[model samples]
Target: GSQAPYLSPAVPFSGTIQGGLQDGLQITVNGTVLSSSGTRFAVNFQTGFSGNDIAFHFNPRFEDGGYVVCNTRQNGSWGPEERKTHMPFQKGMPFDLCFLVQSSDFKVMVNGILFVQYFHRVPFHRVDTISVNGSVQLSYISFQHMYPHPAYPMPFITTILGGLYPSKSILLSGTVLPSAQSFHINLCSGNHIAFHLNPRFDENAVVRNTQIDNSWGSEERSLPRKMPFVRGQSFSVWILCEAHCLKVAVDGQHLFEYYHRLRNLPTINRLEVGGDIQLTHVQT
Candidate 1:
């Protein structure tokens, strides 16, 4: 079951993680880092709103040329810090941060790539509350309950629950194979493909088009900026369903929009992703 998302939540946000964290539960925080205020922000999974026993503390500081600090707290006492020197966030840039819980550790993915894994220092099941505070603006905090799949098989296909609607969104997070040639994400209406988003590394173009009754339509292969997908690197593809079109963003940057060729939006309920990528997370 997918929990309802908190849309445009105010800063210093805190909410209950329904039923607490479980294996294969992915928590996604979508937002932008504000450049106007503090140089630090944090996301904490804790026991309660009191912030006394934090199971996982993910704090990113814009100091010391930028680094991230991860730690645990037990009964108001702090543990040792684990630092990641490679920064993945920037001021004024939107980001999709995912925390996937497992039995032994929490896998953290920034944008799309596997950023870090925080092993259990305390009982993870005791973490029922999530808190966010610092220099960031939140778009939403959503939850996807899934069975743990270490590596999604190629040609991955899944249903879009209740079909598509305005404000509905899907997230594809994965890494392209180093020897990758191309990859495609299709939103289908039964046997007809309503939207086809294909990224060709060889041509360095992300082609968008539609296929109806086995007939391929003219492709839209233009971008305002350079190619967004890089082979051998992690990426996140966010597709926002609008009334008239589907807006696509790669790695948090708005890239392009594909107008609807199929009239009924809700009928386009199937998502198919195939090609040379190892999917880390899929949120529909």
Candidate 2:
């Protein structure tokens, strides 16, 4: 068919390839034929480009011989996929590669492992289909239909802007430690927010608003449910801490309200581990 593009030492391919490459394309690299150019094809890397690159190569010939397509420039190299271990491509077997458009990073899913991460050099909205030129039988190829992007508010347990922002009206569902402990959360701004828990002196679980102002507020109370802090089981809370004063949600439900916190200012990024506490997932 078409002679695939290659980067020879003579005419080194560096910059991104320009063309109408929007509708996503797929290429199956089977060992069935060859071309005058070589065993490579026309693909774009993110060395000097934009948008995350993700491709799947299925070679059902060797026991463990597949291809990796990525766009990570390291140490003067163009593509990082050249260094990864090849996936075993047995006869009639197939492997898949997928990626999602993340805020700043590309959430790449390879055979279910969230291993590779490609930052957006170019917006994913601008990328289309990639042309494949080789001797591989093309099986199934399709792009995830793009839909109207949804505007999700700041997550309760996010690691983007600053730290985890607790809501004002929180429902301390599930179980916590009977002893007082602390939890650390990372933020997008490279800071951390600490959540402290005190043993309930009475039958009700107590959540105190301990902020930087050295003032504590006994906001809400709930019947202390005794769900052990297992490694996977999680809890949710909603609170309006004094630091940022913004309504924050934990584990999917709106628990409280924040006073004067700006949504774009970038705070409460991630949740850190402190004391004897285990968790599964947290939502805002």
Candidate 3:
């Protein structure tokens, strides 16, 4: 969603988020915890570049029975400490940490698990700068402009933002259940399905097609390689919007390109994801 991620920012690093923070925005930090000599590492989302004001301070300590400390600060003073006794990270191990911004709180997910949530002590929009310090070595700090759909039953459907355009990518990440049937992703405009991608494990095929006014279109069920999805494993699918067509990639590799079957591209304002899978991350 960002032009690209901040690649390997220096420690004690700080960066500006183009458009502050908003509901449904997900930021991911992938890195390793260096245990050579430090006790803890921290990530802070604050206003301006000052240490006086911070909306969130996420600190993971390698001591005191290994807990995570979260707190807020104002005018150089912090509020009461909120500690999570269960540790999700360890020294010398790499971790994938994700922060999901919601209306009232920030949800933290570690290695795809819903780890914890911190309530807003102050307005999160006031936080425009994200900085990191301490014992962690960050590989990247990335941002995703997400319009997320949460807790809908299977056959999940949600409206996207202002339709699609270049650089607007949709990410779907989750685990394929052991006894999976099939799962499909659809980009639609009103009642018409402009692009349909179905990975049917039963058929040993990944199918593509469209549907308009109750009529199904031709199916393009060919792949340049074998099935990218496997049962009972984690996977991420990125559907990047383009000027003429939708470019799809699986696990970061370009898989296929589906041309616009329905001409009005901007009106493809809805995204539908359903069928077999524990949908962990959906960004439209």
Candidate 4:
């Protein structure tokens, strides 16, 4: 939550984590592996720019049956290698790689799936710089602090940092309460609701509309597919902001896009979520 992400940084990249690594802090790398070139790439958390004392070395090797290697380095000497034999990456494919720092180990998630955990060999707090090198084209390197799966209260609201810009996205995961009626997510600009996404279980419609000065605009009730939300089921919603519209996806499937009724993108900075759902995770 502290560091602004490095967007499209050059390869052989190195950046500092504002206050070094901390428990519950997650580092995510979004990129595509280049086609069958270098055959390897590495993301390392170390004390400084030099690779002499790496606290965590995450190396993905596209060889030797395609295994991932984890290790640590001290004075340029690497410790014993810890290997995960199952490959979670492929050439020419985009990947979401995340490393979560915990009290005892590093939890690795590849494309949203838990991949492996490497026990910390050194105190993780000393790792300040994150360096990436090898055969991957990066989109961004981001940082987020995660909670221990705490339940969020209904009517959740959070401010968007620097407001909405193109490529900015909001991610939320929650469960629809059994016997629920409806839930809504709103993107607001002070007195006006710039965008309102209302999923009505009773009407069996996912409604999209805008509200200004207490007046509602025409509702959009069409969907390319059936209603995606079901009572007693969990769901993930991703809302991505673009220059001209907002693209909404549910459970990783593209749902619908809504053009901006309120064209000032930056002022539509507040996100509000409410109704009969319990939120488990939210990333804005």
Q: What is the C-alpha lDDT of each candidate?
A: 0.86, 0.34, 0.81, 0.84
- Give me the candidate number with maximum lDDT: 1
Rank by lDDT (best first):
1, 4, 3, 2
RMSD of each: 5.2, 17.7, 6.7, 7.1
TM-score of structure candidate 4: 0.62
Question: After TM-score superposition, what is the CA distance of residue 229 in candidate 2 from its true location, in Å?
Answer: 7.9
- Per-residue CA lDDT of model 1 for 80-127, tens digit only, reads 999999899988666778899999999998876788899999988999
lDDT by residue for model 2 (209-259), tens: 333334344443332344222232334333344445644343332334434
lDDT of 4 by residue, 190-276 (tens): 999999999999989999999999899999887889998889765667788899999887754578899998998889889899998
Better of 1 and 4 by lDDT: 1
For candidate 3, the 10 contiguous residues with the lowest summed lDDT are: 145-154
C-alpha lDDT (0 to 100) for residue 122 of candidate 3: 83
- TM per candidate comes to 0.68, 0.27, 0.60, 0.62
Cα lDDT of model 3 overall?
0.81
Per TM-score, the best of the predicted structures is: 1
Residue 16 in candidate 2, Cα distance off native in Å: 25
Ranking by TM-score: 1, 4, 3, 2
